[PDB]
Amino acid sequence: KFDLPKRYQGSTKSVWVEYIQLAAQYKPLNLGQGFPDYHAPKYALNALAAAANSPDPLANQYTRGFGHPRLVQALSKLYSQLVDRTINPMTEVLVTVGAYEALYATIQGHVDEGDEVIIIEPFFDCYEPMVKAAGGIPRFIPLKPNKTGGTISSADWVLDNNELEALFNEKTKMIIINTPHNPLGKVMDRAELEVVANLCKKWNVLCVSDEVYEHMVFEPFEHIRICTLPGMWERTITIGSAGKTFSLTGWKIGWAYGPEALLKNLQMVHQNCVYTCATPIQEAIAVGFETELKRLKSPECYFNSISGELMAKRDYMASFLAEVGMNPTVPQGGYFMVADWSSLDSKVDLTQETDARKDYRFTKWMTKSVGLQGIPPSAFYSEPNKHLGEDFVRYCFFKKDENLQKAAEILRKWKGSS
């Protein structure tokens, strides 16, 4: 009967290990998770096969700990252009096992016992347990909509700037931002970025920018990197993911980039966690970046076409969710959509003596009864703020159109025509 006082409390199973099992069990239409239902860019897949089949015996053995040279070079080339600076491929970038381990290396490497970390709700669920495991003290601020009538935009979900500055103090070590945002799809504009950038500069805090969905912003919006703001490069760490950039979530390769001084900490954590990442996968991703770097402005460039591909799907889902009676939040980016479901909202019917956040029971009930899987957004809120996400649900619309129609059908049937 021992105890692991390393701040490894609760979190018995993450929402994913939980819901990934329900999907393996009731095998419904999987609108939960977060990945495409169809094949990723062929050039990327071909490149992995090419690495497996390479005549070079080094292609499937250990590569550099901090990242495959070909990949790191490619990464530098891309982000140097986007950041308007020459990022050193050897010291200002680190390759990791997805954006997950990038987040882990960052939080473990820059938050010590007592350090306060500000997290914006709803948040990608791993932020809080990561900070906790590091001995940090999370402080939460929720995003909230601007009066919801029916269909709104993720731009309508805003935090209270006065509440934000109040959380900043001499103990504040880090703030984590996620743009484009999961699960709302919100794209922070310049003013919103400046608000957190000013606070970071006044209080000397580290900004961690989770930008895995960087290429998935819908017109007329635009992704802005906070590390490009006036004095932010010196105090920002930016994270990306190959699984999101190339729609190959199964490859689990991500990266962090920023000043050599901040990145050193990440390197020490990484080195003593997994040491190195898969070589053939890193090579294939390097080839993929090299492929896109040649056509960065072309409409065939995957960094430019994914949003046009997704936009139609986004609009489709917003329409059938609204038609069924939900109040969807149309995302400015990404492939997630949060919607306010209705059935006990203002039509107090069924009860729940169980008392355990509605969005969890609704979402579960659905995949087990009607065979449509969504995920409960309360899973992305601190314990005392969970209630904020109980009337919602998150759905992924990165699916083949036949499957999107399928969802619309099961929802229309679940309801009634007339």
Added chain:
Amino acid sequence: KFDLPKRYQGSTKSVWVEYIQLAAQYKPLNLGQGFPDYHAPKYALNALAAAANSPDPLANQYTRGFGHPRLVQALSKLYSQLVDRTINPMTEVLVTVGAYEALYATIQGHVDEGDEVIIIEPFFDCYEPMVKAAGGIPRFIPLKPNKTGGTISSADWVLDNNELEALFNEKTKMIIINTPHNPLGKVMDRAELEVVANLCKKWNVLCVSDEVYEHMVFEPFEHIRICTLPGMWERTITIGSAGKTFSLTGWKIGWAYGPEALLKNLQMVHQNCVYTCATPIQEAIAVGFETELKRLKSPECYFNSISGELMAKRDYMASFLAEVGMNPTVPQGGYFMVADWSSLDSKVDLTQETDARKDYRFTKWMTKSVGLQGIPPSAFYSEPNKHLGEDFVRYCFFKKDENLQKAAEILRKWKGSS
């Protein structure tokens, strides 16, 4: 300039980086890599290619979390027979990013502030920093040879039992064992296994058994798993690696198996560290196990054939090293060989990191002067015990016959057959 990360060990002294840099700069005959310089079993490579090219779009998207179902099934099938226990593929097996992350999850999930962890020297690189990072207190004991019996075998490298028993007390949380040993290649016999087991039972300590080289024991000897000894299953966590099993060190996939009670701790760490591992690699490894499973008792089984392949190379290296005037420790398993160099010491040829350790000096000198690269075993000792490694060098003989030949010819040219 940023100082230490934050109460963390800046393991920039990680030997691999400076030795990788050395090899690039002098391009010697490299006996320091730790992986083959030729290709792994074609079925495995072909399996990866097939996964990249799979008609199933989910082949390259997120898989389970605790491990790809097709992999954990195969893992349980193999090890269940090996330990003569039905291992639950879902709760008693955990897939990780190499044996490295398996070690990380085990030490992070079972070592808390103040916990003592005994480490056997020479130790695999990551054992000390991982323990320190977890707030634990390492307690070191070296394996020392018996040089007074003609030639030397890794079996002659032994622990002082009195010293070992004295190291265990109620504060001992964990003991890490590595069999076959890196880099001695020592294979713990049943009696040595019993010494550790009895200690573990007497003081209620968790035994972490690093068995990555489990399939590479040379015929005279046999790999025995401590988790099979009386009362040990309930207190052992055993780790392996696909990189070492299939000679695909760039694939970075490993596992831990043992009671669900012990694995639970690992799961909590893993899920908030990397969450999940590469799907196409895990698929390729699953088919690799499936392939071998079908011929486990046949001599063409890679689990059975690797030792014969390596044994010839081992004998070849032991011979030419003795030729030059070194005294090699012939390993019982694995593909590393430690040898005592009694050649020119820090007298004329040496003059490098003089301050530092002589085995660094010697190894760097031979790379620059002779064009033959080995690794300094001093790197794998605690500071107070480093002197025990200064007389030695680590070579890897998992190399093309022609390169082994070239190494032999370089040493001969350096020397002089009388």
